[model samples]
Target: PGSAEIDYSDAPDEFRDPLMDTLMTDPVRLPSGTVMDRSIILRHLLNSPTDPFNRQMLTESMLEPVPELKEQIQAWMREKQSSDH
Candidate 1:
């Protein structure tokens, strides 16, 4: 007779976003010599849920658009795009 036992007690907790777990702690240079830190990039993604872009996208539909707020967000987006470029 063969008996098998299954255990799930040591399984990891529910899937969570390990924004810091996979990020780089040191600076690295790309092939083109562009230097950047892995943590910096992932930190942004980690905080994106609370960032203005995603926050606005989430509330834009539900919130009434005030002229000032609209203008502010537009400016923010423009600035963000400019920075990326």
Candidate 2:
């Protein structure tokens, strides 16, 4: 599934969401169904170990990687690069 909102991030340079933009840079899916960058999520976790949206308890163990999604994003980036050049 793709994002409904438009993202103007440098990494993707495409109309994608946080998941697509930060795919390679440690993306995590929260219990509240919110996907965020690892560093940012970790920072938020430090202050509170609860899902910001659902207000449910969250832990590091709950954090998972998106290597497949990352790979797909990388592939798209490579495709875009080749087309640009």
Candidate 3:
């Protein structure tokens, strides 16, 4: 029997936002009322002006900073870092 296993060991281990599915350092709220990372949404916005979640019209002015979520993510990152050491 010949079986080949897919290899994902070479994948990058960059930090990612749970909602955006992309590497992010800060979180923001979309017009669609969903919270995601600034980088992921902005990157998507560059090509289109609609929320990725709902395809609704979107603009930079519509993004709201989610400070509380940002802090939570920071705390999570700290815990993860300490565990890795």
lDDT per residue as tens, model 2, 30-84: 6556666667667667889876445578898888766655666766666555655
**What's the lDDT for residue 48 in model 3?**
98
Candidate 2 clashes between residue pairs 3 or more apart in a chain or in different chains: none
Q: How would you encode candidate 1's per-residue C-alpha lDDT over 1-85 as one tens digit per residue?
A: 8974332233222211133332122433333323334344335446562222233222112322234433444454454456542
Model 2 C-alpha lDDT versus the unseen true structure = 0.59
Query: How far in Å is the alpha carbon of 29 misplaced in model 2?
Result: 3.3
**Lowest summed lDDT over 10 consecutive residues: which window, candidate 2?**
13-22
**TM-scores, each model vs. reference:** 0.24, 0.57, 0.64
Write one digit per residue (lDDT tens) for candidate 3, span 1-85. 8964332232223335655454465768876777777877788789899876677889999899888766765676565556542
Clashing pairs in 1: none
- In TM-score terms, candidate 1 sits at 0.24
Ranked by TM-score, the better of candidates 1 and 3 is: 3
TM-score, ranked from best to worst = 3, 2, 1
Listed per model in order, the count of residue pairs whose N, CA or C atoms clash below 3 Å is 0, 0, 0
Model 1: ten consecutive residues of lowest lDDT: 8-17
Off by over 4 Å in 2: 1-25, 31-35
Ranking by lDDT: 3, 2, 1
